[PDB]
Amino acid sequence: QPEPDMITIFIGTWNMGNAPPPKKITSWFLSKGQGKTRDDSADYIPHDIYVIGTQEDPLSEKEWLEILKHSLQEITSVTFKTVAIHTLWNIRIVVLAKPEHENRISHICTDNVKTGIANTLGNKGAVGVSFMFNGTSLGFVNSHLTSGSEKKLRRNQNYMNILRFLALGDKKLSPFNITHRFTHLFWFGDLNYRVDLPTWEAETIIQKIKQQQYADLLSHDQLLTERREQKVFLHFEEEEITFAPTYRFERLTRDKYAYTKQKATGMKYNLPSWCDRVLWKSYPLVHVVCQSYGSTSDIMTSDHSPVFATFEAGVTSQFVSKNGPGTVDSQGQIEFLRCYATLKTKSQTKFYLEFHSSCLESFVKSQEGENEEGSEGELVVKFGETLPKLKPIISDPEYLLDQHILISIKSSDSDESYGEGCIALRLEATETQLPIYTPLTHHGELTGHFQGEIKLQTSQ
Numbered sequence: 001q002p003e004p005d006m007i008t009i010f011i012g013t014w015n016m017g018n019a020p021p022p023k024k025i026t027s028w029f030l031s032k033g034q035g036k037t038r039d040d041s042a043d044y045i046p047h048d049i050y051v052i053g054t055q056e057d058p059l060s061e062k063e064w065l066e067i068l069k070h071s072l073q074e075i076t077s078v079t080f081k082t083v084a085i086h087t088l089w090n091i092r093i094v095v096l097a098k099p100e101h102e103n104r105i106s107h108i109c110t111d112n113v114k115t116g117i118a119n120t121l122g123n124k125g126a127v128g129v130s131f132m133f134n135g136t137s138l139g140f141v142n143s144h145l146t147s148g149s150e151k152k153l154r155r156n157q158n159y160m161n162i163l164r165f166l167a168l169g170d171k172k173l174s175p176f177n178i179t180h181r182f183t184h185l186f187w188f189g190d191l192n193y194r195v196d197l198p199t200w201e202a203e204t205i206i207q208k209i210k211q212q213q214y215a216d217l218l219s220h221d222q223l224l225t226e227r228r229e230q231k232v233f234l235h236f237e238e239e240e241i242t243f244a245p246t247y248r249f250e251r252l253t254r255d256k257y258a259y260t261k262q263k264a265t266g267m268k269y270n271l272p273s274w275c276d277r278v279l280w281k282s283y284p285l286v287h288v289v290c291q292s293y294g295s296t297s298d299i300m301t302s303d304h305s306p307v308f309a310t311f312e313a314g315v316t317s318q319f320v321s322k323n324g325p326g327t328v329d330s331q332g333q334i335e336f337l338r339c340y341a342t343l344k345t346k347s348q349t350k351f352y353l354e355f356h357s358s359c360l361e362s363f364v365k366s367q368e369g370e371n372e373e374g375s376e377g378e379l380v381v382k383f384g385e386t387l388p389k390l391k392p393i394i395s396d397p398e399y400l401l402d403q404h405i406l407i408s409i410k411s412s413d414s415d416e417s418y419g420e421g422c423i424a425l426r427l428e429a430t431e432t433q434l435p436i437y438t439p440l441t442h443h444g445e446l447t448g449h450f451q452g453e454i455k456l457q458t459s460q
């Protein structure tokens, strides 16, 4: 049986509003309802991996697992294996996979982050799962961020705390947060960003929703506007939204948005909003295609509607040669020419680079670069032609061209990373000087750039 070069991944996010689900939730896993929906002809085709995020989940892990497995069994006639389940308070993530993938899946990690201090610590945060699928690293984050239309800044801070402190993936990648540790990272949940229009416009907003005219609403969506000003989710993607706001509904129908202020809401309006979202970040030049993004119409136990997203994701095999793993392939090398980092730092320390990749036996430290002044104030760290020659474990181009090099620029004085980025080895040519580029981030904020030239030698 050949190893796959593609898998499909189902991502679900549902704030259950502390109510048990209805007897049937199959529409969710079939991507049926409003938005970008899945073709009927695919209904019997199982996804390879289902990742279910819930918020305000009132069920035990046992109760929810039984509902999910029995749901997928009804749809597919396949009994899915439980990869991982992790719960923080009422925030939960479940990863289920087809039984044929059981021995393709390894290095399963779970973690949580609690957001806020005192008052604000006690029910918001994130849970996550990572694992290897053959040669491909996969991360999944389910976050329930701070609620309320006037707290978008608090949501942005929650995001930064989650991506700083969630401990998933390969701990040897010590300079890198979860936004660099995975071939494919999916981040979903009740992100709680609102449509920021005046309260007096509520009935107008409802009108627009009934006409399926979402354009003037999405232009005020706080997640889209914060993302466009680079305040949150920098270098993440989201599919176009073509489904009605998923919050806040009267329960047991979808015909009414319950937006007016009530004692139960802390006297806060809940204008119709896209609270419930799926975003992703994959390494450069890896295949990832969103094939559905929508909401269910028939699951009405919560004041939120479930959201689904499905993806095709490129995956690689667990490569063995005569040489690597367990030695180098002297027919392989990665050289860096005319390289320099540009940093927004106001500091003056020497800097060096670390190169991290699963194509190397271990990470590689460079010599210190040469600091120069940029013409517009910037620090420019010149490496020129001084960067070491990287020695991959496998020289076969069918392996090496599918790999990536993570780069950290570190202070010589503190050994703290000032910027992290990623370079694809999926080059237009081998044995050829080619431009490379990555933005550099730290705690998910832009800190600089790394650019130069690469020269990749493979066995071919």
Ligand SMILES: CCN1CCC(Nc2ccccc2F)CC1
Pocket: 081, 082, 083, 097, 101, 102, 103, 104, 105, 106, 107
């Ligand atoms: C040989 C590696 N090994 C394979 C099984 C894996 N566990 C697992 C994978 C997928 C579904 C359910 C599971 F329990 C733990 C590590």
Ligand SMILES: CCN1CCC(Nc2ccccc2F)CC1
Pocket: 224, 225, 227, 228, 229
């Ligand atoms: C170079 C890739 N990049 C270009 C388009 C950009 N678009 C965007 C950013 C923030 C909010 C809404 C958006 F549509 C996102 C990805």
